[PDB]
Symmetry: D3
Subunit: 260 residues, 6 copies
């Protein structure tokens, strides 16, 4: 049977729940996970990249801040096609990785693995159209949200656009707003939206995403007292990243060369 | 909604209208334009290459000769899909680029010619079976668009029944390939892209200038001699080599400057 | 017209019929064939790799053992689409290559076996979940095609109900994978591709020679022992490693010679 | 005249004095500084790499912790040879870079530029000889020190190797100790030693470098009350880094590709 | 015996004497010469690059203008050490290449131009104008020129002329943004050239204004081999190229074989 | 203190004493040894390459034939300088590697042969001027060390006045190169490295076995026939191709596994 041409960009929000885990998690990612991954999908993934998160900002924990990285893939086919379950070589994946990323708690309950599929192009351009790289360095705050069980999706959308987006648009500190609807049909991801919101720096982020958002009234479905009113790491995940990453893995990886 | 699998090769004819602009245009292309471009389409363009033009030959001006390069992309999806208009980072594009390439004057402006094609040539009209072992080629790539109110079928008939026979008769011409432009993608005025190979500039001239004097002047002619089309508007061209070092998705390592 | 999205993995079984031909065949493959191939299909082939065969094992000749390599491509479109027949530059292909690989004699010629598959194995029959951490594999890749007038369904039933169970039972065998050949693409005579992993040559021999002695000789047998198929015509194979340095779209930098 | 074969490894300790500067400094480093640098020394530098610092640990400020990265070069000739002062193209260097790194304040004192030359091979192997990458992920604490004005160098050396290093050796948390003398003859660097001290993690670092070092008595020349007893960023600089960096710039750099 | 550490930058001035030869010469360079060269010196050459020449400017012929490229190597050891003459695989080098480049004439009837291979230190010895120029300051038209004074001209006198008569005209011209110079290492391979200069402009017009028009003010030296600056015999005592800041042909990093256009 | 500029090429003769060890040895070399090595010497080694050996020829065992590969390094400094003994990260080195290569048995082990040379061959004795255009070479690289108490000058005289003239006379032999081993670096027992080219295995055998029967057996002979030296102890060799894909500082991208 045929395989469908299904170009998509996916994002995984990778946390590191303790600094003591960082060397181990980082080693697994770069030493073990990259080659396993390329080995499997080189023929049908056109880009595979890691975007290390900037230092967690103040109150970033309330946004499900990924303290390790964003993992980004560009697919030509759906990885959730059941035919793609068969692999000559399976990935080397210690259960410890789940501890390091917080999927399993210190045994807190655990945090889910958030793997959001999107179209390759942003669906909505809500602020900053025409911005070039010449305009300067961006503090790029990528955030995914999923409305809690039994909140009507259209009602969540209405909240987002009526209440939240206008505050982003109004803030001179915010230079760019982009959004896409999560493709729910692919893997049953709980998230509904991915937004990217750019600032000049952490202080700008905080002014807008913490101080300006104090004006919002608390929705009836709120799972925390303040914006984003969603349960950290379960219904909201995020990372602040730079414009550039050296970890463009299909082009740039040359093995796990160690420092002398 | 779905995105359609639309594998295509595109060619852009990049001129440099004065030698005094060459350093600036070349810098923009290699220093600024490459990274902006790769940044945008790395996931759905499988090849992105520049083919620097050989020195403009005698009477090359009459063929809309691109004095900088051909720019070549291989796409997996149509770039003219409206959904692809949204970009996180837009390209850095000074207005001066338009002057350098001759789109804007600083007597008359020339259009930006961006022709989409299938990835494989539709017609193989001479030289089938030629290998790289057979020698170095002077590859004359030429695109033409018939003027307003010329029946396309009539233009096609002229091309294939009058023009190509002259190419076939010349032993100096080693290869003829052609494809119809995909006009449905971006409204390009051009109708055909041909590639015509010679051994060298003198062969090109003997055939494309001297042998073509035998053609009679069509009624729609916009100039007295072949190609009878308005330079840079209804005909563009470049002569290029078999190989380019500028295979940008594989070969680019930043704008390293000479010491 | 449209081109169909047709992701496929293909395998070619490349023999070297005499050791005296090995330097010449290897030179052609790496010096001439790689650049010709990349030149043609860079935009619509996502991976192009050679897997050198391990030394031919005892009785390997009876399995149509490829003494040079497996050649592997990953395609986004069918290479047998008639539109893909047209190429600006054709491959440089000396007739001697056919001699070296045994397609023609300098007793009897062997066919060119080019099998198209889906990119993912259809059947996982032993060893699901094996990781690279579990150790080095001796990977025996084997393709078979039932002789003329053997019912395909009957051959399939034999393969999966008689042959594969012997593989499954052997502790020496760590992995069994299989896919049906896509016969609709290029008319390949082969019906199945299997990959069967061992620890080493001795394990391969214990299972593929000694354990297979238990099989009844089918009525259609073309040789007395498993695989009961005519070497190089109805069975081809190679044993290869997990890794190859010849990942050609990523790793090739020209034919640099030893000092 | 001849050029001397002078193989050396150099380290630069690159700070970022405010989180608000991080995007700008990081952009300059990766977008502007890399190509300028490669352009100049590609023919006589065999390796050029950046090692991003792990998050600053508790009390890391007291160690002159470089909040951006270590910059590492391997030279075949001395960069301080006066003939090497001439360059066709000079580096693009906004004065703001000095602000971002803390060399100058915002329009005697910011912090000096610390550029330490070493031999390519560590001179002293004081703990953990034989360690392989198979033995696990390392938290690699690289630290350079320079004794203050009018402290006898031999006396400082004796203190380092007879008082400080024994505490490192006694700690099971410390898996590796390496040291080299700074080549002072190259560029007049104030630093005298570079050490690298490995731990499993941040907690190990802190247990040893803060808690175990409380047992040291305060030298007469001390410029702060606790180990390392040297003035942060002036007489001590440091960074904790991983075994691997994706920023192996002579091999891995493909231009400043921006995230979509 | 020991090999001496001898870091050097070399330049070869590669001409193409007819446009009809360009496809063949270019094919040889990129298809045959690159891999042969890398095969030989990968272990002791740290950079190998080609800088294609800009279109020959007006009166460029009088400057021994190389119509193909500059070839640039960075050596760790002297290639003229006699021990380096032995090579497992020798370069494939048809005598036709010499025709294409103008070293020999095309066909026996009843001199061409010499091969100019100049060794330099890796760093310019003299920075005479434009110190501190960055890439941010804009695109350069980089005119690289090598000169060798004719037989029986005192070298010190030639030097004094160069630096005290010629360079001041460059200094006075606002069109000229950079002047760099090094003495040729004559001890390596007996090259006739004495100096390599690089002189930067914004563009061809600037080059011409300065190197042709402003130089008309020079008086003609007694040793002159032509009436106008540079007063030296084209291709024999003067060679040159105008090149860009950047080349895609950084061959040790960038070469992936002779991939042909579709 | 200073480090001396000491440009050298070194060769290591890597055997594989049983086919059952080949997957494991090959995995260690490509998965573990490459990154460990690059990690250590990237800043002062300009080239690091593996040349896989062709199949062992008839009687190749008598020449200490390396059944895995030649390992080749180009150094800027002496790796045997005692200061280079200190390394942040030591190589991961299972003792089994010594079994696989035959240094240790599962009576007698074979030594590790690591020969340092100048980067350029000292003697060109046949085939000067041969280019890659002249064809594919079967390159037989052989190192020899005269036994204890044989005068070195006498061995040299034998090599160059008795052995090499047989190579010179044979039309099957297209190239002879030789260098003296640098004994001062690491105490290597070997005295010479030669490379001797043929067209193929048959040519190798005709010359190195049949033509060498004419030599009289030296008094110091450790075996009856040429090379008259103890296999793997006083003679080691490999036949290799002109090209290797394993140019490790340029070409390595991690241990990507076959699908
Ligand atoms: O990036 C991760 C990853 O493996 C994604 C992925 C790729 C291919 C698949 O078939 C698939 O199901 C998932 C990733 C990561 O970056 C960190 C982790 O802990 C786990 C991951 O899967
Ligand atoms: O090649 C050019 C180019 O930018 C093509 C292109 C790329 C991405 C798109 O989305 C698109 O619509 C077009 C190009 C060039 O080479 C020179 C120029 O002056 C302008 C160009 O666009
Ligand atoms: O791999 C080979 C190859 O060329 C396959 C192929 C590609 C495109 C086509 O149109 C086609 O018909 C075949 C290959 C090889 O690896 C070795 C050979 O000797 C010949 C080959 O074709
Ligand atoms: O490492 C930096 C740097 O400037 C190095 C250097 C190398 C060679 C020279 O001749 C020279 O003058 C300087 C560096 C860096 O890597 C990051 C920064 O943010 C600032 C730096 O100076
Ligand atoms: O690069 C060229 C070249 O041949 C250099 C060289 C190297 C070693 C030698 O011993 C020697 O004599 C020369 C070169 C080129 O790149 C292009 C040309 O057109 C001509 C050249 O010589
Ligand atoms: O390449 C090998 C190797 O390790 C060489 C080497 C490097 C540095 C040293 O200090 C040293 O003593 C040796 C190598 C190989 O390629 C295969 C092997 O089996 C063993 C090796 O050492
Ligand atoms: Cl913590
Ligand atoms: Cl586990
Ligand atoms: Cl900025
Ligand atoms: Cl709360
Ligand atoms: Cl749809
Ligand atoms: Cl019109
Ligand atoms: Cl008619
Ligand atoms: Cl006209
Ligand atoms: Cl259709
Ligand atoms: Cl044989
Ligand atoms: Cl049959
Ligand atoms: Cl049976
Ligand atoms: Cl039989
Ligand atoms: Cl690549
Ligand atoms: Cl801060
Ligand atoms: Cl002080
Ligand atoms: Cl204090
Ligand atoms: Cl000496
Ligand atoms: Cl400019
Ligand atoms: Cl003269
Ligand atoms: Cl004159
Ligand atoms: Cl590289
Ligand atoms: Cl065996
Ligand atoms: Cl051959
Ligand atoms: Cl002995
Ligand atoms: Cl014997
Ligand atoms: K204390
Ligand atoms: K004059
Ligand atoms: K004998």
């Amino acid at each position: 049977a045929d395989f469908k041409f299904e170009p998509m960009r996916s994002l995984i929000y990778v946390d590191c729940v303790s600094e003591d885990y960082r060397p181990k998690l980082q080693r697994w990612i770069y030493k073990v996970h990259i080659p396993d991954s390329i080995s499997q999908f080189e023929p049908y993934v056109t880009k595979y990249a890691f975007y290390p998160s900037f230092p967690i900002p103040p109150q970033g924990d309330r946004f499900g801040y990924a303290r390790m990285q964003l993992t980004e893939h560009h697919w030509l086919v759906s990885d959730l096609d059941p035919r793609l379950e068969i692999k000559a070589i399976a990935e080397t994946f210690p259960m410890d990785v789940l501890v390091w990323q917080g999927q399993i708690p210190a045994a807190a309950e655990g945090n889910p693995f958030i793997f959001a599929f999107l179209p390759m192009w942003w669906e909505k351009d809500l602020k900053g159209k025409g911005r070039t790289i010449e305009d300067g360095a961006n503090y790029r705050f990528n955030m995914t949200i999923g409305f809690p069980e039994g909140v009507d999706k259209a009602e969540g959308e209405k909240w987002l656009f009526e209440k939240v987006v206008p505050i982003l648009q109004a803030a001179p500190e915010c230079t760019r707003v982009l959004a896409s609807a999560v493709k729910k049909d692919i893997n049953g991801c709980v998230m509904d939206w991915v937004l990217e919101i750019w600032f000049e720096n952490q202080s700008g982020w905080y002014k807008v995403m913490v101080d300006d958002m104090k004006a919002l009234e608390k929705p009836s479905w709120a799972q925390q007292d303040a914006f984003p009113f969603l349960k950290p790491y379960h219904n909201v995940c995020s990372a602040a990243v730079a414009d550039y990453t050296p970890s463009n893995n299909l082009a740039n990886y040359r093995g796990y060369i160690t420092m002398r």
